[PDB]
């Protein structure tokens, strides 16, 4: 197993961890702010997924400073992970294309 592939799998396991920790900490950060909606865990994990993939419908989002900081970590972890996979697919294609030559 090549490095690019390992970094990818590793990025995916880390993403799943950031999603679960993100869901937990967003609820922790948001309860206490009047009007906040990101306050029960099942919808926070869903919020965490749509943030990490950058879709951002939104239907829910953080209103406090710490929930937002948590949002930024989720965003960056998702963008980095999906980017790592893209780059791993590139390394794979470039390697196999040099063999077809």
């Amino acid at each position, epitope marked *: 197993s090549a490095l690019h592939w390992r970094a990818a799998g590793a990025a995916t396991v880390l993403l799943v961890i950031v999603l679960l920790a993100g869901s937990y900490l967003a609820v922790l950060a948001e309860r206490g702010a009047p009007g906040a909606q990101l*306050i029960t865990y099942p919808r926070a994990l869903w919020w965490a997924c749509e943030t990490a993939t950058t879709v951002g419908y939104x239907d829910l989002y953080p209103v406090t400073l710490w929930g937002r900081l948590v949002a930024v970590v989720v965003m960056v972890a998702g963008i980095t992970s999906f980017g790592l996979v893209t780059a791993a697919l590139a390394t794979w294609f470039v390697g196999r294309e040099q063999e077809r030559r």
Partner: antibody
Amino acid sequence: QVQLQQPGAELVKPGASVKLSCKASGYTFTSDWIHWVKQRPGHGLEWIGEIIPSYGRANYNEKIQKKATLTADKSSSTAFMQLSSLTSEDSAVYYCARERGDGYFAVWGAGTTVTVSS
Amino acid sequence: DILLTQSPAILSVSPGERVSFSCRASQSIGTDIHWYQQRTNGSPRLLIKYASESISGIPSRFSGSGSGTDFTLSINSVESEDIANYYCQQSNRWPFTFGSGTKLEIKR
């Protein structure tokens, strides 16, 4: 078995303070919150505050005057509510309730009847 | 904070009849409404969660409906054991809040 155990009563003199307890059993998770609800005789349910034991953070009802301070004890699985500088207005049944972080109160304590009298 | 209005405060019905308690939220809360029963001297008891979901251990006679700002708790063929106070509670926005309560009364 009873999931939340609370003392049946507490007598407190005006100006004094008391600390109510809520001992929990059954399944316990990192996502549990313990809530406290106040009910005066003949009246409705009034939310006081909440605490997430696994982390120790508490939030309180801003619409009312703060008489409560919540704390939890991980080892003894007990949540505590310290009421301070009480008056007759503070006499009521205080229930603790458990929420699995999904918004509803699955189970309630039997409640502690508090009386503020000389 | 979300204000939950329960009206009427007292509801009188005849045995076996169908009854409906109403809960109106001051703003839209999807289906994040929960219903509780509290008999005289008893502690509250969860009856319906998320507006219409059944709870194990609760007679099938009980059902909930609504979404948005208007919610209903219904009882098919009310009986004596249903005499109590009923509360709705919302979990859509912080802080959680309760409705003021409806009392069920039976005319025998």
